[PDB]
């Protein structure tokens, strides 16, 4: 109870892009995750570290929600402890990461007949990023050895590019909204529990 703000992140009209995901903090309220677990709107829900029925009994101090939108094939790919193309440049999962992702299809919610979309993600980067790190700089990446004096074009390729989703696209290209819930425990009294 206590008016837990779970109706502001999971179900909202607009979500931020994957490269700049929306970060929210939940604490100081008691919630019942049984209703959320028994929902058919979620495409998949499975992870480690806690049982679905044990969520109410265990008490956690902080909850961090990271909401974004990814492709259909990227939902299965993202997982802790594995190296991937999208996981090495935009979102990295720690080995001891507590929590997991929830993905749902929103093709009807977000679809256009044709054109470029406002969502951006990076294809090239200098190196791997630290886990749970957000990058906002959109500077060009010097792919070629020879410098171009910072001029857009060859050997100074722009990393960010759009999705281009289509309603007629395959199941792997469907727009999937993903929210990552992470449970954080610190040297503070627990604030989130169950009834």
């Amino acid at each position, epitope marked *: 109870t206590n008016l837990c703000p779970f109706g502001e992140v999971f179900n909202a009209t607009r979500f931020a892009s994957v490269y700049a995901w929306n970060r929210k903090r939940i604490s100081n309220c008691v919630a019942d995750y049984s209703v959320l677990y028994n929902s058919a709107s979620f495409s998949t829900f499975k992870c480690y570290g806690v049982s679905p029925t044990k969520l109410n009994d265990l008490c956690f101090t902080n909850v961090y929600a990271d909401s974004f939108v990814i492709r259909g094939d990227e939902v299965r790919q993202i997982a802790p402890g594995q190296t991937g193309k999208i996981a090495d440049y935009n979102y990295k999962l720690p080995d001891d990461f507590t929590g997991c992702v929830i993905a749902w299809n929103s093709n009807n919610l977000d679809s256009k*007949v*044709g054109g*470029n*979309y406002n969502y*951006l993600y990076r294809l090239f980067r200098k190196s791997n990023l630290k886990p749970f790190e957000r990058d906002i700089s959109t500077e060009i990446y010097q792919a070629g050895s020879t410098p171009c004096n910072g001029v857009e074009g060859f050997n100074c*390729y722009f990393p960010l590019q*759009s*999705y281009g989703f289509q309603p*007629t696209n395959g199941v792997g290209y469907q727009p999937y909204r993903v929210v990552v819930l992470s449970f954080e425990l610190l040297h503070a009294p627990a604030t989130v529990c169950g009834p």
Partner: nanobody
Amino acid sequence: QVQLVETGGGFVQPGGSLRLSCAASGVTLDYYAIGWFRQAPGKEREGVSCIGSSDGRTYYSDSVKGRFTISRDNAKNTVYLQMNSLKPEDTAVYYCALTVGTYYSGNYHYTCSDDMDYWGKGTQVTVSS
């Protein structure tokens, strides 16, 4: 159901003129970047040129030497490339591929990289003395 076809294969002594035509069918994207990639047996893959369909700006390497002329027929949705001054190192199979554009802060930028979504059956060009 995007389909790509490449035509214009020809064999002739160095110093002639060559023409390549890329035709795309079933394209559901209003704006896209169309690029030519050449590959030869025994050497890796590298891009030579690619153009955007928003107004027609082009991105090219240092080996163009100004001899590559690229035109975009919007009515037929065709890419026509003409070149002269045949170079022995340019003999390879050419593939034309289109990728989705990039929108950022009201500006149009095209990402023209190695990774590609679609592919088509390119054409072989071999020139030797």
